[PDB]
Design a protein around this nucleic acid. Structure first.
Ligand SMILES: Cc1cn([C@H]2C[C@H](O)[C@@H](COP(=O)(O)OP(=O)(O)OP(=O)(O)O)O2)c(=O)[nH]c1=O
Ligand SMILES: [Ca+2]
Ligand SMILES: [Ca+2]
Ligand SMILES: [Ca+2]
Ligand SMILES: [Ca+2]
Ligand SMILES: [Ca+2]
Length: 326
DNA sequence: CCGACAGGCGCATCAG
DNA sequence: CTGATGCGCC
DNA sequence: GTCGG
Protein backbone atom coordinates (compact mmCIF):
# COMPACT_ATOMS: atom_id res chain seq x y z
CA UNK A 1 0.00 0.00 0.00
CA UNK A 2 2.68 2.59 0.91
CA UNK A 3 4.01 2.89 -2.64
CA UNK A 4 1.27 0.70 -4.05
CA UNK A 5 0.67 2.71 -7.18
CA UNK A 6 4.34 2.54 -8.12
CA UNK A 7 4.73 -1.16 -7.41
CA UNK A 8 1.50 -2.06 -9.22
CA UNK A 9 2.74 -0.21 -12.31
CA UNK A 10 6.04 -1.95 -12.31
CA UNK A 11 4.40 -5.41 -11.76
CA UNK A 12 2.11 -4.79 -14.74
CA UNK A 13 5.15 -3.79 -16.81
CA UNK A 14 6.90 -6.95 -15.60
CA UNK A 15 3.94 -9.07 -16.70
CA UNK A 16 4.00 -7.38 -20.20
CA UNK A 17 7.63 -8.00 -20.73
CA UNK A 18 7.20 -11.68 -19.68
CA UNK A 19 3.97 -12.53 -21.42
CA UNK A 20 3.98 -10.28 -24.48
CA UNK A 21 7.59 -9.22 -25.23
CA UNK A 22 8.97 -12.58 -23.94
CA UNK A 23 11.88 -10.70 -22.37
CA UNK A 24 12.54 -12.59 -19.14
CA UNK A 25 15.35 -10.34 -17.86
CA UNK A 26 13.27 -7.24 -18.18
CA UNK A 27 10.51 -9.06 -16.37
CA UNK A 28 12.94 -9.92 -13.57
CA UNK A 29 14.41 -6.45 -13.43
CA UNK A 30 10.90 -4.91 -13.13
CA UNK A 31 10.10 -7.40 -10.33
CA UNK A 32 13.35 -6.59 -8.60
CA UNK A 33 12.56 -2.88 -8.62
CA UNK A 34 9.00 -3.51 -7.47
CA UNK A 35 10.26 -5.56 -4.61
CA UNK A 36 12.88 -3.14 -3.45
CA UNK A 37 10.40 -0.30 -3.66
CA UNK A 38 7.84 -2.27 -1.67
CA UNK A 39 10.26 -2.70 1.27
CA UNK A 40 11.30 0.98 1.25
CA UNK A 41 9.60 2.51 4.30
CA UNK A 42 9.05 6.04 2.93
CA UNK A 43 6.48 7.51 0.55
CA UNK A 44 8.54 7.93 -2.54
CA UNK A 45 8.51 11.56 -3.62
CA UNK A 46 10.54 11.51 -6.84
CA UNK A 47 12.26 9.29 -9.36
CA UNK A 48 15.70 10.51 -8.25
CA UNK A 49 14.81 9.24 -4.76
CA UNK A 50 13.83 5.81 -6.13
CA UNK A 51 17.04 5.77 -8.25
CA UNK A 52 19.07 5.41 -5.05
CA UNK A 53 17.65 1.95 -4.46
CA UNK A 54 19.33 -1.05 -5.94
CA UNK A 55 17.59 -2.23 -9.08
CA UNK A 56 16.00 1.12 -9.85
CA UNK A 57 17.74 2.80 -12.82
CA UNK A 58 17.42 5.68 -15.23
CA UNK A 59 14.43 4.28 -16.96
CA UNK A 60 12.35 3.16 -14.05
CA UNK A 61 13.04 6.50 -12.35
CA UNK A 62 11.69 8.38 -15.42
CA UNK A 63 8.54 6.24 -15.20
CA UNK A 64 8.12 6.99 -11.52
CA UNK A 65 8.30 10.79 -12.22
CA UNK A 66 5.54 10.43 -14.86
CA UNK A 67 3.44 8.28 -12.63
CA UNK A 68 3.85 10.75 -9.72
CA UNK A 69 3.03 13.88 -11.79
CA UNK A 70 0.05 12.42 -13.74
CA UNK A 71 -1.08 9.25 -11.91
CA UNK A 72 -0.64 7.03 -14.94
CA UNK A 73 1.91 5.79 -17.39
CA UNK A 74 1.39 6.48 -21.10
CA UNK A 75 3.31 3.34 -21.99
CA UNK A 76 0.86 1.25 -19.97
CA UNK A 77 -2.20 3.10 -21.12
CA UNK A 78 -1.27 2.00 -24.71
CA UNK A 79 -0.60 -1.58 -23.69
CA UNK A 80 -4.09 -1.76 -22.07
CA UNK A 81 -5.77 -0.71 -25.37
CA UNK A 82 -3.78 -3.13 -27.58
CA UNK A 83 -6.16 -6.10 -28.06
CA UNK A 84 -3.47 -8.53 -28.96
CA UNK A 85 -1.36 -7.75 -25.86
CA UNK A 86 -4.43 -8.00 -23.63
CA UNK A 87 -5.40 -11.31 -25.13
CA UNK A 88 -1.98 -12.85 -24.73
CA UNK A 89 -1.84 -11.65 -21.11
CA UNK A 90 -5.31 -12.98 -20.38
CA UNK A 91 -4.61 -16.39 -21.86
CA UNK A 92 -1.42 -16.87 -19.79
CA UNK A 93 -3.60 -16.84 -16.67
CA UNK A 94 -4.68 -20.34 -17.51
CA UNK A 95 -2.34 -22.75 -15.80
CA UNK A 96 -0.20 -24.36 -18.44
CA UNK A 97 -0.46 -21.58 -21.05
CA UNK A 98 2.72 -19.54 -21.07
CA UNK A 99 3.82 -16.62 -23.37
CA UNK A 100 4.55 -18.82 -26.36
CA UNK A 101 1.37 -20.90 -26.39
CA UNK A 102 -0.70 -17.81 -25.64
CA UNK A 103 0.72 -15.98 -28.65
CA UNK A 104 0.07 -19.06 -30.82
CA UNK A 105 -3.57 -19.40 -29.66
CA UNK A 106 -4.15 -15.68 -30.26
CA UNK A 107 -2.82 -15.98 -33.85
CA UNK A 108 -5.32 -18.79 -34.44
CA UNK A 109 -8.20 -16.52 -33.33
CA UNK A 110 -8.37 -17.97 -29.77
CA UNK A 111 -8.73 -14.90 -27.61
CA UNK A 112 -11.35 -15.61 -24.86
CA UNK A 113 -12.32 -18.19 -22.24
CA UNK A 114 -15.22 -18.98 -24.52
CA UNK A 115 -12.74 -19.68 -27.34
CA UNK A 116 -10.70 -21.94 -25.08
CA UNK A 117 -13.77 -23.93 -23.91
CA UNK A 118 -14.83 -24.86 -27.43
CA UNK A 119 -11.30 -25.90 -28.51
CA UNK A 120 -10.14 -28.06 -25.65
CA UNK A 121 -9.01 -30.57 -28.23
CA UNK A 122 -6.19 -28.09 -28.92
CA UNK A 123 -5.03 -28.00 -25.30
CA UNK A 124 -2.57 -30.35 -23.64
CA UNK A 125 -3.59 -32.09 -20.40
CA UNK A 126 -2.22 -29.51 -17.98
CA UNK A 127 -4.03 -26.76 -19.96
CA UNK A 128 -7.25 -28.65 -20.05
CA UNK A 129 -7.14 -28.83 -16.20
CA UNK A 130 -6.11 -25.18 -15.77
CA UNK A 131 -9.06 -24.27 -17.99
CA UNK A 132 -11.49 -26.53 -16.05
CA UNK A 133 -10.47 -24.87 -12.77
CA UNK A 134 -9.77 -21.40 -14.15
CA UNK A 135 -11.77 -19.43 -11.57
CA UNK A 136 -10.96 -21.71 -8.60
CA UNK A 137 -7.25 -21.41 -9.20
CA UNK A 138 -7.24 -17.59 -9.05
CA UNK A 139 -8.80 -17.78 -5.62
CA UNK A 140 -6.62 -17.60 -2.57
CA UNK A 141 -6.66 -20.04 0.27
CA UNK A 142 -7.29 -18.69 3.79
CA UNK A 143 -4.78 -20.05 6.39
CA UNK A 144 -7.65 -21.79 8.24
CA UNK A 145 -8.16 -23.98 5.13
CA UNK A 146 -4.37 -24.38 4.71
CA UNK A 147 -4.42 -25.78 8.28
CA UNK A 148 -7.08 -28.37 7.46
CA UNK A 149 -5.26 -29.30 4.25
CA UNK A 150 -2.04 -29.71 6.26
CA UNK A 151 -3.89 -31.98 8.74
CA UNK A 152 -5.21 -34.19 5.91
CA UNK A 153 -1.82 -34.58 4.16
CA UNK A 154 0.20 -35.17 7.33
CA UNK A 155 -2.29 -37.78 8.59
CA UNK A 156 -2.51 -39.63 5.27
CA UNK A 157 1.23 -39.56 4.88
CA UNK A 158 1.55 -41.16 8.33
CA UNK A 159 -0.89 -43.94 7.34
CA UNK A 160 1.35 -44.84 4.39
CA UNK A 161 4.57 -44.88 6.44
CA UNK A 162 5.39 -43.38 9.82
CA UNK A 163 8.91 -42.53 8.70
CA UNK A 164 7.82 -40.06 5.96
CA UNK A 165 8.17 -36.40 7.06
CA UNK A 166 5.94 -33.88 5.29
CA UNK A 167 6.36 -30.24 5.78
CA UNK A 168 4.15 -27.56 4.36
CA UNK A 169 6.26 -24.75 2.90
CA UNK A 170 5.83 -21.69 0.67
CA UNK A 171 3.87 -18.72 1.91
CA UNK A 172 2.32 -20.97 4.56
CA UNK A 173 5.66 -21.54 6.31
CA UNK A 174 6.38 -17.79 5.95
CA UNK A 175 3.32 -17.22 8.18
CA UNK A 176 0.97 -15.75 5.56
CA UNK A 177 -2.73 -15.32 6.33
CA UNK A 178 -3.59 -16.60 2.86
CA UNK A 179 -1.77 -18.73 0.27
CA UNK A 180 -2.09 -19.07 -3.49
CA UNK A 181 -1.46 -22.83 -3.37
CA UNK A 182 -0.12 -25.67 -1.25
CA UNK A 183 3.48 -26.84 -1.21
CA UNK A 184 4.55 -30.06 0.46
CA UNK A 185 8.13 -31.11 1.03
CA UNK A 186 8.48 -34.79 1.61
CA UNK A 187 11.32 -36.88 2.98
CA UNK A 188 11.72 -40.60 3.73
CA UNK A 189 14.92 -42.32 5.18
CA UNK A 190 15.07 -44.64 2.20
CA UNK A 191 15.83 -41.75 -0.20
CA UNK A 192 19.10 -39.93 0.42
CA UNK A 193 21.66 -38.30 -1.91
CA UNK A 194 23.56 -41.60 -1.79
CA UNK A 195 20.85 -44.12 -2.57
CA UNK A 196 17.28 -44.84 -3.28
CA UNK A 197 16.43 -47.89 -1.14
CA UNK A 198 12.69 -47.92 -1.91
CA UNK A 199 10.94 -47.25 -5.23
CA UNK A 200 7.57 -45.49 -5.59
CA UNK A 201 8.11 -43.24 -2.63
CA UNK A 202 6.19 -40.28 -3.99
CA UNK A 203 3.70 -42.33 -6.05
CA UNK A 204 2.48 -44.11 -2.85
CA UNK A 205 1.80 -40.81 -1.14
CA UNK A 206 -0.06 -39.55 -4.21
CA UNK A 207 -2.10 -42.79 -4.44
CA UNK A 208 -3.13 -42.53 -0.82
CA UNK A 209 -4.24 -38.91 -1.28
CA UNK A 210 -6.22 -39.87 -4.41
CA UNK A 211 -7.84 -42.74 -2.48
CA UNK A 212 -9.32 -40.48 0.17
CA UNK A 213 -10.42 -38.06 -2.58
CA UNK A 214 -8.08 -35.28 -1.49
CA UNK A 215 -6.14 -35.18 -4.72
CA UNK A 216 -8.58 -34.88 -7.69
CA UNK A 217 -6.35 -34.32 -10.73
CA UNK A 218 -2.75 -34.58 -11.76
CA UNK A 219 -0.95 -32.02 -13.90
CA UNK A 220 2.44 -33.64 -13.98
CA UNK A 221 4.10 -36.38 -11.97
CA UNK A 222 7.56 -37.86 -11.95
CA UNK A 223 9.72 -39.48 -9.28
CA UNK A 224 10.51 -36.39 -7.19
CA UNK A 225 7.84 -33.86 -8.16
CA UNK A 226 4.02 -33.96 -8.31
CA UNK A 227 1.90 -31.01 -9.50
CA UNK A 228 -1.85 -31.42 -9.20
CA UNK A 229 -5.17 -30.39 -7.73
CA UNK A 230 -6.81 -31.12 -4.39
CA UNK A 231 -10.03 -30.22 -2.55
CA UNK A 232 -11.09 -30.23 1.11
CA UNK A 233 -14.15 -32.32 1.90
CA UNK A 234 -17.31 -30.37 2.49
CA UNK A 235 -20.20 -31.29 4.79
CA UNK A 236 -23.94 -31.79 4.18
CA UNK A 237 -25.83 -29.03 2.31
CA UNK A 238 -22.65 -26.96 1.96
CA UNK A 239 -21.18 -25.46 -1.17
CA UNK A 240 -18.02 -27.27 -2.23
CA UNK A 241 -14.66 -25.75 -1.47
CA UNK A 242 -12.78 -24.51 -4.52
CA UNK A 243 -10.29 -26.85 -6.08
CA UNK A 244 -6.74 -25.96 -5.14
CA UNK A 245 -3.32 -26.34 -6.72
CA UNK A 246 -0.96 -28.64 -4.84
CA UNK A 247 2.78 -29.28 -5.35
CA UNK A 248 4.65 -32.10 -3.57
CA UNK A 249 8.40 -32.36 -3.69
CA UNK A 250 10.33 -35.39 -2.52
CA UNK A 251 13.80 -34.35 -1.43
CA UNK A 252 16.68 -36.55 -0.29
CA UNK A 253 16.46 -36.64 3.51
CA UNK A 254 20.07 -35.59 4.10
CA UNK A 255 19.46 -32.52 1.92
CA UNK A 256 16.37 -31.37 3.87
CA UNK A 257 17.69 -27.93 4.80
CA UNK A 258 18.64 -26.88 1.27
CA UNK A 259 15.26 -28.32 0.22
CA UNK A 260 13.21 -26.42 2.78
CA UNK A 261 15.11 -23.20 2.10
CA UNK A 262 14.24 -23.50 -1.57
CA UNK A 263 10.62 -24.50 -0.90
CA UNK A 264 9.98 -21.73 1.70
CA UNK A 265 10.89 -18.96 -0.78
CA UNK A 266 9.67 -16.42 -1.64
CA UNK A 267 10.67 -16.79 -5.26
CA UNK A 268 12.24 -13.32 -5.17
CA UNK A 269 14.07 -14.11 -1.95
CA UNK A 270 15.54 -17.27 -3.48
CA UNK A 271 16.68 -15.30 -6.57
CA UNK A 272 18.27 -12.66 -4.39
CA UNK A 273 19.86 -15.20 -2.10
CA UNK A 274 21.18 -17.36 -4.88
CA UNK A 275 22.50 -14.26 -6.82
CA UNK A 276 24.24 -13.15 -3.61
CA UNK A 277 25.73 -16.63 -3.17
CA UNK A 278 27.35 -16.35 -6.66
CA UNK A 279 28.87 -13.00 -5.74
CA UNK A 280 30.40 -14.77 -2.72
CA UNK A 281 31.69 -17.66 -4.80
CA UNK A 282 28.98 -20.26 -4.13
CA UNK A 283 26.07 -21.87 -5.84
CA UNK A 284 22.89 -22.93 -4.06
CA UNK A 285 20.22 -25.15 -5.37
CA UNK A 286 17.49 -27.20 -3.56
CA UNK A 287 19.97 -29.98 -2.78
CA UNK A 288 23.27 -28.41 -1.87
CA UNK A 289 25.48 -25.37 -1.57
CA UNK A 290 28.83 -25.73 -3.30
CA UNK A 291 31.85 -23.50 -3.86
CA UNK A 292 32.52 -21.99 -7.28
CA UNK A 293 36.17 -22.43 -8.44
CA UNK A 294 38.07 -20.17 -10.90
CA UNK A 295 36.80 -22.26 -13.82
CA UNK A 296 33.18 -21.53 -12.93
CA UNK A 297 33.03 -25.24 -12.08
CA UNK A 298 31.02 -26.16 -8.99
CA UNK A 299 32.99 -28.06 -6.36
CA UNK A 300 31.91 -30.49 -3.70
CA UNK A 301 28.87 -30.04 -1.41
CA UNK A 302 29.53 -28.21 1.82
CA UNK A 303 28.36 -29.84 5.08
CA UNK A 304 25.01 -28.34 6.08
CA UNK A 305 23.44 -28.94 9.41
CA UNK A 306 20.71 -26.27 9.46
CA UNK A 307 19.03 -23.52 7.43
CA UNK A 308 21.26 -20.97 9.15
CA UNK A 309 24.37 -22.81 7.94
CA UNK A 310 23.52 -21.81 4.40
CA UNK A 311 23.18 -18.21 5.36
CA UNK A 312 26.49 -18.38 7.28
CA UNK A 313 28.45 -19.61 4.25
CA UNK A 314 27.37 -16.50 2.29
CA UNK A 315 27.77 -14.16 5.23
CA UNK A 316 24.15 -13.31 5.72
CA UNK A 317 22.46 -12.97 9.07
CA UNK A 318 19.62 -15.52 9.53
CA UNK A 319 16.25 -14.42 8.22
CA UNK A 320 13.32 -16.30 9.71
CA UNK A 321 10.80 -17.64 7.20
CA UNK A 322 8.30 -14.85 7.81
CA UNK A 323 10.96 -12.28 6.93
CA UNK A 324 11.50 -13.89 3.51
CA UNK A 325 8.25 -12.50 2.02
CA UNK A 326 7.66 -10.07 -0.91
C1' DC B 1 30.58 -0.20 -21.70
C1' DC B 2 28.87 -5.06 -21.58
C1' DG B 3 28.37 -9.88 -19.67
C1' DA B 4 25.43 -11.81 -16.53
C1' DC B 5 21.09 -11.96 -14.60
C1' DA B 6 18.84 -18.83 -9.86
C1' DG B 7 18.47 -23.23 -10.57
C1' DG B 8 16.06 -27.30 -11.94
C1' DC B 9 11.61 -30.93 -12.67
C1' DG B 10 8.42 -32.95 -16.07
C1' DC B 11 6.66 -32.74 -20.54
C1' DA B 12 6.41 -32.06 -25.55
C1' DT B 13 8.75 -32.14 -29.64
C1' DC B 14 12.64 -32.52 -33.14
C1' DA B 15 16.78 -34.89 -35.41
C1' DG B 16 18.76 -38.97 -36.21
C1' DC C 1 14.42 -45.50 -29.26
C1' DT C 2 18.35 -41.57 -27.17
C1' DG C 3 19.81 -37.04 -26.43
C1' DA C 4 19.19 -32.12 -26.87
C1' DT C 5 16.28 -28.04 -26.51
C1' DG C 6 12.70 -25.04 -24.98
C1' DC C 7 8.26 -24.25 -22.58
C1' DG C 8 5.83 -23.70 -18.28
C1' DC C 9 6.11 -24.31 -13.95
C1' DC C 10 8.00 -24.29 -8.84
C1' DG D 1 16.30 -2.79 -17.41
C1' DT D 2 20.14 -2.58 -14.25
C1' DC D 3 24.73 -2.96 -12.43
C1' DG D 4 29.67 -3.81 -11.10
C1' DG D 5 34.22 -4.76 -12.86
C1 LIG E 1 7.59 -19.40 -8.50
C2 LIG E 1 8.89 -19.84 -7.87
C3 LIG E 1 8.87 -20.52 -6.68
N1 LIG E 1 10.00 -20.91 -6.07
C4 LIG E 1 10.07 -21.59 -4.78
C5 LIG E 1 9.94 -20.63 -3.63
C6 LIG E 1 8.46 -20.56 -3.28
O1 LIG E 1 8.12 -20.18 -1.94
C7 LIG E 1 7.97 -21.94 -3.73
C8 LIG E 1 7.02 -21.87 -4.90
O2 LIG E 1 5.73 -22.02 -4.69
P1 LIG E 1 4.71 -20.88 -5.07
O3 LIG E 1 3.52 -21.60 -4.45
O4 LIG E 1 4.86 -20.48 -6.49
O5 LIG E 1 5.06 -19.64 -4.11
P2 LIG E 1 4.51 -19.12 -2.67
O6 LIG E 1 4.05 -20.24 -1.77
O7 LIG E 1 5.66 -18.37 -2.13
O8 LIG E 1 3.36 -18.01 -2.97
P3 LIG E 1 1.72 -18.20 -2.99
O9 LIG E 1 1.25 -17.75 -1.64
O10 LIG E 1 1.20 -17.31 -4.09
O11 LIG E 1 1.52 -19.66 -3.30
O12 LIG E 1 9.03 -22.46 -4.54
C9 LIG E 1 11.26 -20.58 -6.67
O13 LIG E 1 12.28 -20.95 -6.07
N2 LIG E 1 11.34 -19.90 -7.83
C10 LIG E 1 10.20 -19.52 -8.46
O14 LIG E 1 10.19 -18.91 -9.54
CA1 LIG F 1 19.79 2.39 -8.32
CA1 LIG G 1 -0.23 -19.80 -17.15
CA1 LIG H 1 2.40 -21.75 -2.55
CA1 LIG I 1 3.22 -23.98 -5.47
CA1 LIG J 1 -17.34 -32.48 -6.70
Amino acid sequence: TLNGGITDMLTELANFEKNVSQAIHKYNAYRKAASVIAKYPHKIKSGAEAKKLPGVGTKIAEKIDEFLATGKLRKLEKIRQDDTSSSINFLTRVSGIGPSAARKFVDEGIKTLEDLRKNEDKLNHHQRIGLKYFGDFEKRIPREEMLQMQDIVLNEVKKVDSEYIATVCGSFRRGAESSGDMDVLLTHPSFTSESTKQPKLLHQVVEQLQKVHFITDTLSKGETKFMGVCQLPSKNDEKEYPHRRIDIRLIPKDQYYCGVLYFTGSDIFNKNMRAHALEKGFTINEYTIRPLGVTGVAGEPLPVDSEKDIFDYIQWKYREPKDRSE
